[PDB]
Ligand binder design. Sequence first.
Ligand SMILES: [Cl-]
Ligand SMILES: [Cl-]
Ligand SMILES: [Cl-]
Ligand SMILES: [Cl-]
Ligand SMILES: [Mg+2]
Ligand SMILES: [Mg+2]
Lengths: 227, 227, 9, 9
Amino acid sequence: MERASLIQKAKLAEQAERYEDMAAFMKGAVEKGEELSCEERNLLSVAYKNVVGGQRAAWRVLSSIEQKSNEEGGPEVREYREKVETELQGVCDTVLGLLDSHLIKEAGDAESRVFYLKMKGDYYRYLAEVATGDDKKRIIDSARSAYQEAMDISKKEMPPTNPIRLGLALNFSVFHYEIANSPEEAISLAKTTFDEAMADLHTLSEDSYKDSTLIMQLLRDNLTLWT
Amino acid sequence: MERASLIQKAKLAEQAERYEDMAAFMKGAVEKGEELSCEERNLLSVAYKNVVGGQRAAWRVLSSIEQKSNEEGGPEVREYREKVETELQGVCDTVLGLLDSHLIKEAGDAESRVFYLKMKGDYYRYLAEVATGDDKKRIIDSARSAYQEAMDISKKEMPPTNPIRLGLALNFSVFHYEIANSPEEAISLAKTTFDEAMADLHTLSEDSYKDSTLIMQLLRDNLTLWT
Amino acid sequence: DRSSSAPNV
Amino acid sequence: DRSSSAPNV
Ligand SMILES: [Cl-]
Ligand SMILES: [Cl-]
Ligand SMILES: [Cl-]
Ligand SMILES: [Cl-]
Ligand SMILES: [Mg+2]
Ligand SMILES: [Mg+2]
């Protein structure tokens, strides 16, 4: 129906904590083919991240049990893990479909482009977490490509403390460590990102500082974990 | 499929926080027509309460917005409130269907019977929260009848500090206040329940005491609210 | 405020 | 433990 009605319903869904509905409303809004505002981008991202987040958490619980049994001591665990996986792949595919059909090519500015390319890398990363065989290889390649393009734009267009730039770098470092099994690249990126941002914090207002250091603390937390 | 496989999958669902799935598995298990153990009763109750809980929370958010607009200053809010309501009614109807088709008549002991009759009263109460007209009247009558039968059994078969008995009395008092608009009956029941239980707390072990006083505190909290 | 009802574990 | 990624508001 009308785009404005879909946005209204997405915001109602959000207040109601109805994230599947929220995502479906935002999908309909994207499909109108107009750009999304900052607010609207965030509605889309929050909705789908809540949906995939539930599936990822469930998949991890089930995969852990499944792995713990395929050592020593029915098909139920496997079967249910497979069901949740298929669901997760469907949601990731839907998001990537929106990004490739509409959002990336229609974005009118640098910030939007980085936002959507990062999302592209993230949803490939979530696919990579559950993938095997040839699927996993092609997914990993796709994630790296998306993240790297986003990184190139962000380095040209955004200051080092910019929260979008910081969050992209954080997630790409997670990719390197968890997905690509490149711990050295992970640490290198996280440390460089942190150091180049620390350099500029003394120039920031209270609110800017809070937004930047939220992400910077996560880079730090990962560095502790990874060393 | 096999009953044991359904129970296994319900417990996996629970660990995964997949409550819709959990409820569907427990529905299949009930439909095998054997009694549920204490553990299994609790799987069923947790699953469906999580599902209806999400819908109730959403309905309340939406109904509040809808009401706040039908004073001074599109159909979207109403339409979405109606969608969520229809969903909620479907879940409540499914639970009541299980209770009437299987659980109440097949229960082999007093505790089971009270548990299921209380559930019957609860799901009618959730229906009553969203009902209007003739539907609301018949639902309210049905809730009262179920609660009252449960109360009669619990008074004969359970001590005053029994957590099931206490929880039933709590929920029936909520019915009186919120649904029946009988504040005097609500207060009277809550106060009597509390006083008759307090009488016996000095006889309880640490663990029994904790289980009983959890519910007793809620009766107290309601009494504060209602006076 | 809404009244409290019995919790589930 | 799993690495932390960027939060959503
Ligand atoms: Cl329009
Ligand atoms: Cl399954
Ligand atoms: Cl069997
Ligand atoms: Cl709707
Ligand atoms: Mg699969
Ligand atoms: Mg209705």
